[PDB]
């Protein structure tokens, strides 16, 4: 209406408004202390309240962009602290708003956020919950200036619920620590996924994004007509292009408009939206993004008629190649919620290659009549990989599955540093836990969602400090080919075994005292180094050295003496292992 700030305060409600304002300033003024942000917030909040009381009071008709910038240019130390950013204050809107956007700092050189002790946290939570919660909201927002503000707020609400539940339990730490591990891991994943999609959009362009979305949205909304999916993809692409440009309010507005459009047209989109569409503005787009797949239409034909049989395949294709290809994707994806989106794209791309050849030929129908046979192998390759890995997981359990992976990936790419091997194998292991639990029909999507980030973090680590041609080869492939390429890496037979180091395989009795998580990391570090030193060792030779170690550890950790048993028996295990391998 007349006052943007007032309209945002009425839609969001006071609590949400204050938190979002905190996150928004935090992400720009990343070196200002917490107490200075409490001050901005209270100042922006009292102003907003005067506009609620009276839409036409002084300054209430300014744009939110204008007010945000004005507030930013009001910080006294802005030049001293942020430098270039203060020169934005000399510009007029809209140039000013675009100048602020260029001058966020992505790596503010801030010490990492240490998780205090449980009783320290729960005491702070009891004494000043709002301070505890917003001080940490500030610390996270300042460290992740591109984390979509409303999503960060959603996380904060889950942290609050976990403190609320767990700080009253019998065993506080056993309740809370798993929840914070889970929240940290989801927050880190959500953050890398937001960054990867914007990098993808720029790298692979808008067509590939649109392909990706058609497939994802047809799986979610299989009852929708194609033209509806297509409308939603066009808008989704807009949203995501604006969101990647980094202006939070424009992003939020475009997301809200789309959410509104979907809710006003549920009957044309999906039967699963009722609940999301009843929620308030703030939660609506987020709830829509998480909704489960609608049940597909009861009795659907095979895609044979429209895409192989029908005489107007080549004619329908040449007329609008991407509409046609998109229709194929839609039809394939709606009947296959059980595939990864990239599988579906491999498929679509196979059908594209095939129409480009076959529509150029004398009898098109006969050239391409067997195109669906070429999909069988593509579909089976990830299905088999899921079978093999989830069966191997069941008989081994998370920890020893990771170890199976260590051995396997270290023999594949032994040039990779031991810490990157450990972390990536530990992580792949967790993707095996999370996703081999799901029923068959959600396994491949799950694994996709999670491998995409585990693999992109492996690549970014590695392209910022490189070691293996192959790894680079797979990381600079198409994003459809990324995972298959990694899967095809073979044991490196041109690797020169790493020279023995005494210390690497020396263990002191502190390891009997380390936490579960840390003792595994120490063991897994040694396993990697063991495989680096003797790459030729077989699975049974390695199991003999590993089961020898398993009996070395526990038969010096319950003993009348400790660090002697580790010094003296640890000479015996090492020389016996060197001889055996």
Ligand X SMILES: CCCCCCCCCCCCCC(=O)O
Element (H, E) at 417: none
Q: Which residue has the tokens 């690797």?
A: 495
Q: Which residue lies nearer to ligand X by CB, 255 or 272?
A: 255
Least distance (Å) between residue 87 CB and ligand X: 21
Q: Which residue lies nearer to ligand X by CB, 6 or 526?
A: 526
**Closest of 257, 356, 372 to residue 307, by C-alpha:** 372
- Identify which range of 197-205, 508-516, 541-549, 559-567 contacts ligand X by CB under 6 A: 541-549
Q: How many CB atoms lie within 10 A of CB 493?
A: 8
Query: Could you give the residue ranges of the DSSP H alpha helices within 291-374?
Result: 304, 313-319, 321-334, 341-358, 364-367
- Check the annotation: does 286 bind a ligand: no
Query: Could you give the residue ranges of the DSSP H alpha helices within 413-491?
Result: 418-437, 440-463, 469-475, 482-488
Q: How far apart are CA 35 and CA 355, in angstroms?
A: 63
**Surface-to-core class of residue 498, CB atoms within 10 Å of its CB (0-12 exposed, 13-18 middle, 19+ buried):** middle
- Check the annotation: does 54 bind a ligand: no
Q: How far is CA 246 from CA 75, 269, 536, in A?
A: 22, 29, 50
Quick check: 69 binds ligand X (CB under 6 A)?
A: no
Shortest Cβ contact with ligand X: which residue? 285
Tokens describing residue 231: 């409308």
Quick check: 269 binds ligand X (CB under 6 A)?
A: no
Q: Which residue lies nearer to ligand X by CB, 171 or 181?
A: 181
- Check the annotation: does 144 bind a ligand: no
Quick check: 282 binds ligand X (CB under 6 A)?
A: yes
Quick check: 137 binds ligand X (CB under 6 A)?
A: yes
Among 3, 218, 219, 230, binds ligand X (CB under 6 A): 230
Q: Which residue lies nearer to ligand X by CB, 128 or 487?
A: 487
- Cβ contact 257:245 at 8 Å: no
- Check the annotation: does 10 bind a ligand: no
Quick check: 201 binds ligand X (CB under 6 A)?
A: no
- Check the annotation: does 36 bind a ligand: no
Tokens describing residue 131: 């301070």
Quick check: 189 binds ligand X (CB under 6 A)?
A: no
Three-class DSSP category at 263: helix
Which residues 25-64 are close enough to bind ligand X by CB under 6 A? Answer: 44, 64
Total residues found in the chain within this entry? 581
Among 313, 545, 556, 566, binds ligand X (CB under 6 A): 545
Q: How far apart are CA 226 and CA 543, in angstroms?
A: 55
Least distance (Å) between residue 574 CB and ligand X: 5
- Identify which range of 193-201, 293-301, 307-315, 348-356 contacts ligand X by CB under 6 A: 348-356
Question: Dihedral (C-alpha) 552, 555, 558, 563: value to the nearest 10 degrees?
Answer: -50
Quick check: 152 binds ligand X (CB under 6 A)?
A: yes
Least distance (Å) between residue 237 CB and ligand X: 7
Quick check: 424 binds ligand X (CB under 6 A)?
A: yes
Among 386, 453, 475, 556, binds ligand X (CB under 6 A): 386
Q: What angle do CA 158, 159, 162 make, to 5 degrees?
A: 85
- Identify which range of 27-35, 272-280, 300-308, 522-530 contacts ligand X by CB under 6 A: 522-530
- Check the annotation: does 65 bind a ligand: yes
**Based on C-alpha coordinates, what's the Rg of the chain?**
28
- Cβ contact 581:541 at 8 Å: yes
Least distance (Å) between residue 319 CB and ligand X: 13
Tokens describing residue 166: 């767990």
Q: How far apart are CA 290 and CA 113, in angstroms?
A: 29
Least distance (Å) between residue 246 CB and ligand X: 13
Quick check: 435 binds ligand X (CB under 6 A)?
A: yes
Quick check: 239 binds ligand X (CB under 6 A)?
A: no
Least distance (Å) between residue 167 CB and ligand X: 11
Binding site: which residues?
1, 4, 11, 65, 238, 242, 245, 247, 250, 253, 257
Binding site for Zn(2+): which residues?
65, 245, 247
């Amino acid at each position: 209406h007349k006052s943007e700030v007032a309209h945002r305060f009425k839609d969001l409600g006071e609590e949400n408004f204050k938190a979002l304002v905190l996150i928004a300033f935090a992400q720009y003024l990343q070196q200002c202390p917490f107490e200075d942000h409490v001050k901005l917030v209270n100042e922006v909040t009292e102003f907003a309240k005067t506009c609620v009381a009276d839409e036409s009071a002084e300054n209430c008709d300014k744009s939110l962009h204008t007010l945000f910038g004005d507030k930013l240019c009001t910080v006294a130390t802005l030049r001293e602290t942020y430098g270039e950013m203060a020169d934005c204050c000399a510009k007029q809107e809209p140039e000013r708003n675009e100048c602020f956007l260029q001058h966020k700092d992505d790596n503010p050189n801030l010490p990492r956020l240490v998780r205090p002790e449980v009783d320290v946290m729960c005491t702070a939570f009891h004494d000043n919950e709002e301070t505890f919660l917003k001080k940490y909201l500030y610390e996270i927002a300042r460290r992740h200036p591109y984390f979509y503000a409303p999503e960060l707020l959603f996380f904060a609400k889950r942290y609050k619920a976990a403190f609320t539940e767990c700080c009253q339990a019998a065993d506080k730490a056993a309740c809370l620590l798993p929840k914070l591990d889970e929240l940290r891991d989801e927050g880190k994943a959500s953050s890398a996924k937001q960054r990867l999609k914007c990098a993808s959009l720029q790298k692979f362009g808008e067509r590939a994004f649109k392909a990706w979305a058609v497939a994802r949205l047809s799986q979610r909304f299989p009852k929708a007509e194609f033209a509806e999916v297509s409308k939603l993809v066009t808008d989704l692409t807009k949203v995501h292009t604006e969101c990647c440009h980094g202006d939070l309010l424009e992003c939020a507005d475009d997301r809200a408009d789309l959410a509104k459009y979907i809710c006003e047209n549920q009957d044309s989109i999906s039967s699963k939206l009722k609940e999301c569409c009843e929620k308030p503005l703030l939660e609506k787009s987020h709830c829509i993004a998480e909704v489960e797949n609608d049940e597909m239409p009861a009795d659907l034909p095979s895609l044979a008629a429209d895409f192989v049989e029908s005489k107007d395949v080549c004619k329908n294709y040449a007329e609008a190649k991407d509409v046609f290809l998109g229709m194929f994707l839609y039809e394939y994806a709606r009947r296959h919620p059980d595939y990864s989106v990239v599988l579906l794209l491999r498929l679509a791309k196979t059908y594209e290659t095939t129409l480009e050849k076959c529509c150029a030929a004398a009898d098109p129908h006969e050239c391409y009549a067997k195109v669906f046979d070429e999909f069988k192998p593509l579909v089976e390759e990830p299905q088999n990989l899921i079978k093999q890995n989830c069966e191997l997981f069941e008989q081994l359990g998370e920890y020893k599955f990771q170890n199976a992976l260590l051995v396997r990936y270290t023999k594949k790419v032994p040039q990779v540093s031991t810490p990157t091997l450990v972390e990536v194998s530990r992580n792949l292991g967790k993707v095996g836990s999370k996703c081999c639990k799901h029923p068959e029909a959600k396994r491949m999507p799950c694994a996709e969602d999670y491998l995409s980030v585990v693999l992109n973090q492996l690549c970014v680590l590695h392209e910022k400090t490189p070691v293996s041609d192959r790894v680079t080869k797979c990381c600079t492939e198409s994003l459809v080919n990324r995972r298959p390429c990694f899967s095809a890496l073979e044991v490196d037979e041109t690797y020169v075994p790493k020279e023995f180091n005494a210390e690497t395989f020396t263990f002191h009795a502190d390891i009997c005292t380390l936490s579960e998580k840390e003792r595994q990391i120490k063991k897994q570090t040694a396993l990697v180094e063991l495989v680096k030193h003797k790459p030729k060792a077989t699975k049974e030779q390695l199991k003999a050295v590993m089961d020898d170690f398993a009996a070395f550890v526990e038969k010096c950790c319950k003993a009348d003496d400790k660090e002697t048993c580790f010094a003296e028996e640890g000479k015996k295990l090492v020389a016996a292992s060197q001889a055996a391998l």
